Design an enzyme around this catalytic site. Structure first.
Site, short mmCIF file in Angstrom:
data_model
loop_
_atom_site.label_atom_id
_atom_site.label_comp_id
_atom_site.label_asym_id
_atom_site.label_seq_id
_atom_site.Cartn_x
_atom_site.Cartn_y
_atom_site.Cartn_z
N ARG A 1 0.98 3.83 -3.34
CA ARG A 1 0.33 5.22 -3.20
C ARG A 1 1.49 6.40 -2.84
O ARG A 1 1.36 7.26 -3.67
CB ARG A 1 -0.68 5.23 -1.73
N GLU B 1 0.91 -0.99 -0.08
CA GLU B 1 0.00 0.17 -0.11
C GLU B 1 0.83 1.21 -0.18
O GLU B 1 0.48 2.17 -0.67
CB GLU B 1 -0.81 0.07 1.29
N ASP C 1 -5.12 -10.07 -8.72
CA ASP C 1 -5.37 -9.13 -9.77
C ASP C 1 -4.17 -8.39 -10.26
O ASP C 1 -3.71 -8.49 -11.44
CB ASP C 1 -6.29 -8.04 -9.30
N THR D 1 -0.67 0.91 -10.36
CA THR D 1 -1.97 0.26 -10.05
C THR D 1 -2.57 1.28 -9.05
O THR D 1 -3.83 1.15 -8.87
CB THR D 1 -1.79 -1.11 -9.49
N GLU E 1 -12.05 0.88 -10.67
CA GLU E 1 -11.44 0.10 -11.78
C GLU E 1 -12.40 0.11 -13.07
O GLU E 1 -12.00 -0.28 -14.04
CB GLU E 1 -11.47 -1.47 -11.26
C1 LIG Z 1 -8.36 -5.98 -0.77
O1 LIG Z 1 -7.86 -5.83 -1.92
C2 LIG Z 1 -6.67 -4.55 -2.23
O2 LIG Z 1 -5.63 -5.18 -1.70
C3 LIG Z 1 -5.07 -6.47 -2.35
C4 LIG Z 1 -3.86 -6.67 -2.02
O3 LIG Z 1 -3.93 -7.37 -0.84
C5 LIG Z 1 -5.03 -6.08 -4.03
O4 LIG Z 1 -4.99 -7.43 -4.60
C6 LIG Z 1 -6.39 -5.56 -4.56
O5 LIG Z 1 -6.37 -4.93 -6.00
C7 LIG Z 1 -6.98 -4.15 -3.40
S1 LIG Z 1 -5.81 -2.76 -3.69
C8 LIG Z 1 -6.24 -2.27 -5.40
O6 LIG Z 1 -7.51 -1.31 -5.33
C9 LIG Z 1 -7.66 0.12 -4.88
C10 LIG Z 1 -8.55 0.80 -5.72
O7 LIG Z 1 -9.84 -0.13 -5.63
C11 LIG Z 1 -6.08 0.69 -4.85
O8 LIG Z 1 -5.57 0.83 -3.62
C12 LIG Z 1 -5.38 0.29 -6.14
O9 LIG Z 1 -6.11 0.28 -7.24
C13 LIG Z 1 -5.10 -1.27 -5.75
O10 LIG Z 1 -4.37 -1.70 -7.02
CA LIG Z 2 -5.46 -0.67 -9.10
#
Ligand SMILES: CO[C@H]1O[C@H](CO)[C@@H](O)[C@H](O)[C@@H]1S[C@H]1O[C@H](CO)[C@@H](O)[C@H](O)[C@@H]1O
Ligand SMILES: [Ca+2]
Length: 451
Positions: A90, A86, A219, A443, A355
């Site tokens: 970010r 994270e 993902d 991402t 997304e």
């Molecule tokens: C719970 O899902 C989040 O965390 C897991 C990792 O533990 C990721 O696999 C998953 O994509 C998201 S983080 C994802 O989405 C957010 C926006 O919806 C944002 O922080 C960022 O786009 C990130 O890729």
């Molecule tokens: Ca993302």
């Protein structure tokens, strides 16, 4: 010139930002309904995530004010545990994009300081990093109940660390993250390129074998195979090979069609049993597929991209608020009185996630079909109608199926301003603006230069 729909995005951004400034300045997150704030990092998360969005939207006085905060108030020595992934997507990503757009070396100095403080996470027997690291004390550790890390988390930090090494001339960042990629390239236990959700930091091997999802925990692994390949000038063939393999695996094992509309969707697999559950997170995939086609991936990927884009659009528009829930389920067989998009009562929240609009941006950029702009505008209007807080800000909501009582959760996630509104602004642009030839987005929607 800015057009009508871009002006609308800017109105939304500025209404969001006025809440952040009044009630949460320099704090991680705005709680707009209560006119307060929350912390988890204690590093001005929303501000950092929004830097590049402010720059791109032309909000230069706001950017300058935020730059001053970074210069005087952003410090990384506190005794605080942060999640490596994270943190990276970010803060590191946001600082790097702010640097590139503004040319202001402050942002790179801060990125390098932060990057150095993340490095203890890689000191594991396998060199697959721990989930958490304390930026002030230098101690890294896994979660309390396991020595596993999450596969998407360890494979979705590479763009940022690679770019940090390129800019600083310090190879340690690139070397650490590339070890992870190379190791996972040779692991057993994939299913036609599909990866398990967890990986043990001591043994280096996948765990939770036989369970495959393209949503949370996996993902962005797939996303970053393609994006690293693009970033590196299309010379790292193993990344491309693993990506191409995975998309064939999705086609072979995870794709089904809904009833009654025959929408193409991606489900989950557990020990060979198919589940028609699809996280909204999976909606990254149409955009990533289209991005790949722009860069030379086969036309079959575009066929799939357009089918999945329709599906992700329907996940929004079939709800009473027009906003997708966190998780949907689909029916493989006709059910009297039922829509395509089913939602369990517990899954009805919307966290202002990007997304769908992310993927609309890429579908529009690659196809030029203005319907994708129209769908994005529809979704923006739904955010405005159902998530706006009068005093400033927008909030996650608990019930996308109740237009009268959407029930705000009193939180504005940083990715609303970092991602959702950036992609919408870009979707509507008539412009040379962050060209697919010149940048790749991380991402968290932070653009980084193609080498
Ligand atoms: C719970 O899902 C989040 O965390 C897991 C990792 O533990 C990721 O696999 C998953 O994509 C998201 S983080 C994802 O989405 C957010 C926006 O919806 C944002 O922080 C960022 O786009 C990130 O890729
Ligand atoms: Ca993302």
């Amino acid at each position: 010139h800015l057009n009508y729909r871009q002006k609308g995005v800017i109105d939304v951004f500025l209404h969001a930002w006025k809440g952040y400034r009044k009630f949460a300045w320099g704090h991680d997150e705005l709680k707009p309904v209560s006119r307060s704030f929350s912390e988890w990092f204690g590093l001005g998360l929303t501000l950092i995530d929004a830097l590049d969005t402010m720059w791109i939207l032309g909000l230069r006085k706001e950017f300058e004010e935020a730059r001053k905060w970074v210069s005087k108030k952003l410090h990384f020595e506190k005794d605080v545990d942060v999640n490596l992934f994270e943190s990276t997507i970010r803060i590191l990503g946001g600082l790097l994009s702010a640097y590139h757009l503004s040319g202001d070396s402050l942002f790179l100095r801060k990125a390098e300081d932060f990057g150095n403080r993340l490095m203890p996470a890689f000191r594991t027997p396998s060199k697959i990093p721990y989930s958490d690291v304390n930026i002030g004390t230098g101690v890294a550790h896994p979660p309390r109940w396991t020595s596993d890390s999450t596969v998407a988390e360890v494979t979705s930090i590479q763009l940022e660390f690679r770019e940090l090494s390129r800019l600083t001339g310090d190879k340690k960042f690139q070397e650490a993250v590339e070890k992870v990629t190379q190791h996972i390239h040779g692991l057993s236990g994939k299913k036609d390129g599909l990866v398990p959700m967890f990986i043990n930091t001591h043994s280096g091997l996948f765990t939770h074998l036989g369970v495959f999802t393209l949503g949370a925990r996996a993902d962005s692994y797939y996303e970053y195979l393609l994006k690293q390949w693009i970033q590196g000038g299309k010379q790292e063939t193993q990344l491309l090979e693993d990506y191409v393999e995975a998309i064939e695996g999705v086609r072979t094992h995870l794709l089904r069609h809904s009833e009654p509309s025959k929408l193409t969707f991606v489900g989950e697999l557990a020990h060979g049993r198919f589940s028609a559950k699809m996280d909204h997170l999976v909606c990254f995939l149409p955009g990533t597929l289209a991005l790949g086609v722009y860069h030379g991936l086969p036309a079959s990927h575009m066929e799939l991209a357009q089918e999945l884009m329709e599906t992700c659009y329907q996940m929004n528009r079939q709800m009473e608020t027009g906003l997708s829930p966190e998780i949907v389920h689909f029916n493989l067989y006709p059910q009297p009185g039922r829509r395509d998009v089913e939602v369990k009562p517990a899954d009805r929240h919307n966290l202002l996630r990007p997304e769908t609009v992310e993927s609309l941006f890429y579908l529009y950029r690659v196809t030029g079909d203005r319907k994708y702009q129209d769908w994005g505008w529809e979704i923006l209007q739904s955010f405005s109608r159902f998530t706006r807080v009068p005093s400033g800000g927008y909030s996650s909501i608990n019930n996308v199926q109740d237009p009268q009582k959407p029930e705000p959760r009193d939180k504005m996630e940083s990715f609303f301003l970092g991602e959702t509104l950036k992609y919408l602004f870009l979707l509507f642009s008539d412009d040379n603006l962050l060209s697919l030839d010149a940048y790749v987005f991380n991402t968290e929607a932070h653009p980084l230069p193609i080498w």
